[PDB]
Amino acid sequence: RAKVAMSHFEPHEYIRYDLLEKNIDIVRKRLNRPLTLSEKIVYGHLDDPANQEIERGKTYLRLRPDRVAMQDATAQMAMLQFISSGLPKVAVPSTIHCDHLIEAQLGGEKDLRRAKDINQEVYNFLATAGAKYGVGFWRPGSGIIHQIILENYAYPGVLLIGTDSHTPNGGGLGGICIGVGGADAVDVMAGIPWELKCPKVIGVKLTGSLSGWTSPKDVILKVAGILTVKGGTGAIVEYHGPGVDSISCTGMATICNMGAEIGATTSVFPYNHRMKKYLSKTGRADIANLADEFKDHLVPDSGCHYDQLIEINLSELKPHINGPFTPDLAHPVAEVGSVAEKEGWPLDIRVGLIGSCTNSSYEDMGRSAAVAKQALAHGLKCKSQFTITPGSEQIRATIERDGYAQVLRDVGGIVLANACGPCIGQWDRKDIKKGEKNTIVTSYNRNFTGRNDANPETHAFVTSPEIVTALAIAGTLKFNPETDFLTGKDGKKFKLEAPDADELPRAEFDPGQDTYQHPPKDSSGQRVDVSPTSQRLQLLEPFDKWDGKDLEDLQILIKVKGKCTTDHISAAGPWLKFRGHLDNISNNLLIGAINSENRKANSVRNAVTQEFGPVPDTARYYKQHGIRWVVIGDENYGEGSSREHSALEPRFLGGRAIITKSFARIHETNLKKQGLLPLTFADPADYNKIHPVDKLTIQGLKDFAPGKPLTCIIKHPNGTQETILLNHTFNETQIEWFRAGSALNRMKELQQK
Ligand SMILES: C[C@](O)(C(=O)O)[C@H](CC(=O)O)C(=O)O
Ligand code: SF4
């Protein structure tokens, strides 16, 4: 066909749209109905399109992804599992991005130099394991994983998986990009089919066009408020309608990115002329030309059916700000000042932060510079502290060149390294004491308790970068950029004009400094060294195979009340230091979850000693003494980040099952991957039948089967027993992971030994 390479770094790996077309056509001859765009790209990547059972929301699809991307906080454990497999080389194009371990403190270059010293051992391990197994390596300072992928690797029709829940960002260039845990990434790197539950499809029809202060971020802040954090579970969100051509390619990536906060499997936009333009300005005009020849397969079929349809008229959409606490608590910027006042949320903004993968594009930086230049023209600077995170080295070099970084420094901002930084709590914040109630506004995406600075009382609101800039200049939530007046230096009241700026540089992008390291795919004689006394890296010892018996008289470690995110289960911030060391990071297990017994975090009753203490310590005591335990949770358990450490840590400390009213998708898969039993109540009111003091027996593991519930006997202390039924979503592939002790153990059994 055409021989167009997948990227500039893999000149010999060609885009297979011929394959995509062939598979789409086998499938539509079987289904005889129009296909949505996400169905075309997902079913076009089936391992066996002729025989695959296809029912939305019901069957597990066996898929062949085109490439794997990892960032350094999840790559360590994905590579330690790949090293246990014993396999010599990765089977698909794979990259590691070093963006999560650079702490914001002094700003830019200074923080990057310090991170390279402090994290030497880890950057070393990832670069060496990358060279050995054939994984491309983007060095610290290169940029945030998703901005590097949009700029270099995402293209229309790609199926990409990434070990990060904001991998959907790549949907802004028409590809299906899905967040997974490290063991799912090991499957694909090892060459075995990846399984995904066939998604439902929510269609969002965009009408009109954005104007004034409204930006792409407002579309997904509105959709999150409508669908809520659990409304997208099990579905792909597919944006369509005439309003789509009104949004820039990076704007579309912003909207797909934050679809992770409603639990969506991913989000996607159809290939159009704004994506073409972006591909050409990022050196990929040949890929835009080939996608023009396969365009019919890169847009939805006429008359395709969405399981749910939402319509948003972009011309009536006004600026939003969401939070504090949850990303679906949506408010117009015009009313947040009065709601804050009413709810007792601090009105004064201590810090304004722009960037993160969600909003760190060239257009985002130009729109923020456009607000800031107006303030400067009246002799003002930010009243709040103000930080700017460029998404990649190319964006940092280009906004530096085109003058936007200096405008942002002149209003009082500090430019941080091209890294996650304050977005996952890698921030040496000293302006508030811990426990001090305060408000920060960001252009990020999640705003869960203690995620940016480990202070539970920080009220974090997420909005667009131009509104963070306007509010940082005013210093208060009680400021609406569209209506209100600031007073300049000269005494005159003035109003901010709505920002206007170019979507892409007129000139070319300046690539900045060299940051990619290609694998020698010749030589590869690397020894990966993991010191046996390291506190940051530790090789894995395989989990135990199932004993063949039912699980009797299980102790409840904790019955959790309410929201239980993967940041509650395995916190980030300071704990990122131990992401390659399973025993050391397991000391954060469930320390943020609220115990229903006392409503406290990290205080559970030890059943033997009858002392209340830390959850990690209590789980290790039970494991030392042979007491097998269970976690009981509420709705949407495991919401958020994809970190498989939330599943590895309960397995390591002796847990056996997690029983909840419902699971977020990625965490439920990660639990199954690690040999645990994720089970849901067949009747959710049964959550109220179980008391912290009860022992539980799970029966029927011997004839464990797809679609057959398991029986749970609740043993009450007074002698009463009650039987309830528990549902599971295991298929036979997955029951094999459980019987082997983990998916990695099963894979190693298939290697004939
Ligand atoms: C840090 C993270 O990027 C996050 O935003 O929560 C994570 C991955 C991780 O825990 O390392 C995510 O979204 O999956
Ligand atoms: S959401 Fe924040 S922490 Fe996750 S990749 Fe993006 S910038 Fe990094």
d(CA 438, CA 681): 39
Is the CB–ligand 2 distance for residue 445 below 6 Å? yes
Q: DSSP letters of 82-101?
A: HHHH--SS-SS-EEEE--SS
Terminal-residue alpha carbon distance, the chain? 41
Residue nearest (by alpha carbon) to ligand 1 atom 3: 164
With CA atoms as reference, report the closest residue to 56 among 35, 76, 87, 29: 35
Residue 396 labelled as part of a binding site: no
132 C-beta closer than 6 A to ligand 2: no
Whether the CB-CB separation of 32 and 145 falls below 8 Å is answered with no
DSSP string, 630-646: EEE--TTBTBS---THH
How far apart (Å, rounded) are the C-alpha atoms in residues 686 and 682? 8
Identify residue 59 by its one-letter amino acid code.
T
Asked whether residue 451 is marked as a ligand-binding residue, the answer is: yes
Those residues whose C-beta lies under 8 Å from the C-beta of residue 434, and which sit 6 or more positions away, are 454, 455
Interval between CA 102 and ligand 1 midpoint (Å): 14
Would you identify the CATH topology of the domain 202-314? Aconitase; Domain 2 (3.40.1060)
Resolution (A): 2.0
Domain range 1-201, its CATH number among 3.30.70.20, 2.60.120.640, 3.40.50.620, 3.30.499.10: 3.30.499.10
3-state secondary structure of 490: coil
Closest CA to 179 of 633, 581, 657, 639: 639
Output the 3-class SS for 418-477: CCCHHHHCCECCCCCCCCCCEEEEECCCCCCCCCCCCCCCEEEEECCHHHHHHHHHHCEC
Whole-Å CA distances, 170 to 70, 174, 407, 443, 594: 14, 7, 29, 18, 35
Distance CA 651, CA 122 (A): 24
144 in contact with ligand 2, CB cutoff 6 A: yes
Smallest CA-to-CA distance from 205 within 241, 238, 174 is with: 241
Question: Does 357 show up as a binding residue in the annotation?
Answer: yes
Which ligand 1 atom is nearest residue 424's CA? 1
Protein residue with least CA distance to atom 2, ligand 1: 641
Q: Which helix (H) or strand (E) holds 629?
A: strand 629-632
3-state class of 558 per DSSP?
strand
Q: How far is CA 194 from the centre of its chain?
A: 19
Cα 500 to Cα 366, 369, 409, 495, 497, distances in angstroms = 8, 10, 19, 15, 9
CATH no. of 315-489: 3.30.499.10
402 annotated binding-site participant: no
**Distance (Å, whole) CA 62 – CA 193:** 5
Distance, CA of 278 to CA of 740 (rounded, Å): 47
Is the domain covering 533-753 a CATH 3.20.19.10 domain? yes
Nearest Cα to 194, choosing from 78, 88, 42, 328? 42
CA separation for the pair 682, 665 (Å, rounded):
18
* Residue 31 burial (10 A CB sphere; 0-12, 13-18, 19+): exposed
Where are the chain's structural domains?
A: 1-201, 202-314, 315-489, 533-753
Strand spans (E) along 24-83: 60-63, 67-71
Question: What is the C-alpha radius of gyration for the chain, rounded to an integer number of angstroms?
Answer: 25
The approach used to solve this structure was: X-ray
As given in the structure block, the two tokens for residue 456 are 């539970």
Separation of alpha carbons 347 and 440, rounded Å: 10
Same fold, 1-201 and 315-489: yes
Cβ neighbors of 184 (< 8 A, separation 6 or more) are 161, 194, 669, 673
State the catalytic residues.
99-100, 164, 446, 641, 643
The reply to whether ligand 2 has any atom less than 6 angstroms from the CB of 627 is no
Task: Confirm if 60 and 731 have CB atoms less than 8 A apart.
Answer: yes
> Is 423 close to ligand 2, i.e. is its CB under 6 Å away?
yes
